[PDB]
Amino acid sequence: MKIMQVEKTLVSTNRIADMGHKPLLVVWEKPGAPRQVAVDAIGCIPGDWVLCVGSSAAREAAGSKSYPSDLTIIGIIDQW
Template identity: 75%
Template sequence: MKIYKVDKTLVSTNRIAMMEHKPLLVVREKDGGTPQVAVDPVGCKPGDWVICCGSSAARDATGVKGYPSDLTIVGIIDKWEVPQDADTTS
């Protein structure tokens, strides 16, 4: 698992049927980092720090074994001391 910051919502109206209507969010490991798309089954908002899992664990975390995800948010971090060397400007 890794810690990411939610950047923004990703809108995608045309999806394969298996993706259902689960929300998609753009997340980054740090500000200015490479954006990645994560499935959000927990209800995050931009600015939240979250815990994500990847690979087959990401598919399992959606609740559907065959779900096409390789990054899924599994928790919102309530309190976390951001490391001094982390760039947290938005």
């Protein structure tokens, strides 16, 4: 897994219908790294340090085992 930091939120009005109702967040390693997008299964604010998992693991961690995802937030780090 990875230690990421949240920047902000992202909206796409036309997503496929299987993406459900879940939110999306922009995350990097450190400010200035390439930015990625994760589905948020916890509820996080900008400036948080979070744990991200990406694989079929991420598919099942966000929703069910056929969910269209490859990066999911699964926890908030207590101290970083």
